[PDB]
């Protein structure tokens, strides 16, 4: 009852064995210590470019679905983002049921006498409200 | 490299007066949902 180690069956430990077989790390443990307290880049280093196709697809789908406003010859949709409008001083914006981001461009002016600073963000904040109103 | 330089104009500053004409036509909607 004190030296029966020679009669003890062999421990298998299938999980730990399969983990240590090829994964030379500590995956079978809590790995949220250095992750939850650090802003590491998980994925989409340069592969995010491939998501632009799906982004443009979703943008076109939402455009087709939602009743578009008057043309104004300024409507456009391409990669990267969706050019909202460019007629006159209209700015462009797009996202990144579904969210809707903004602040990609700004207003334009002429006949200088420099132009107004970035205090326009106020309206942008209201735009944010219009982004969350979803009417 | 530019966080203190505030370029003042004060010529077209009238725009701020026009600023108090959008919330009156339509106000923003409070969310209280920081998703």
């Amino acid at each position: 009852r004190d030296a029966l180690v020679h009669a003890r069956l062999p421990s298998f430990a299938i999980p730990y064995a399969i983990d240590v077989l090829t994964t030379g790390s500590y995956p079978r443990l809590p790995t949220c210590i250095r992750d939850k307290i650090i802003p590491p880049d998980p994925i989409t280093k340069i592969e995010k470019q491939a998501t632009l196709h799906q982004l443009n697809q979703i943008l076109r789908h939402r455009l087709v679905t939602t009743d578009l406003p008057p043309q104004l010859a300024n409507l456009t949709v391409a990669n990267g983002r969706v050019k909202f409008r460019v007629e006159g001083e209209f700015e462009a914006t797009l996202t990144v049921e579904v969210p809707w981001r903004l602040l990609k461009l700004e207003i334009l002016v002429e006949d200088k006498e420099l132009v107004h600073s970035m205090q326009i963000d106020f309206i942008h904040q209201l735009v944010q409200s219009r982004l969350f109103a979803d009417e | 490299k530019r966080k203190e330089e505030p370029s003042s104009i004060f010529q077209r500053q009238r725009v701020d007066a026009l600023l108090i004409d959008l919330r009156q036509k339509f106000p923003p909607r409070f969310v209280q949902q920081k998703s």
Partner: peptide
Amino acid sequence: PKKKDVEFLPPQLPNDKFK
């Protein structure tokens, strides 16, 4: 919960052009 007030003062574009 970002803000529960009405703000227009924060801009406060200074003059600093006394002649």
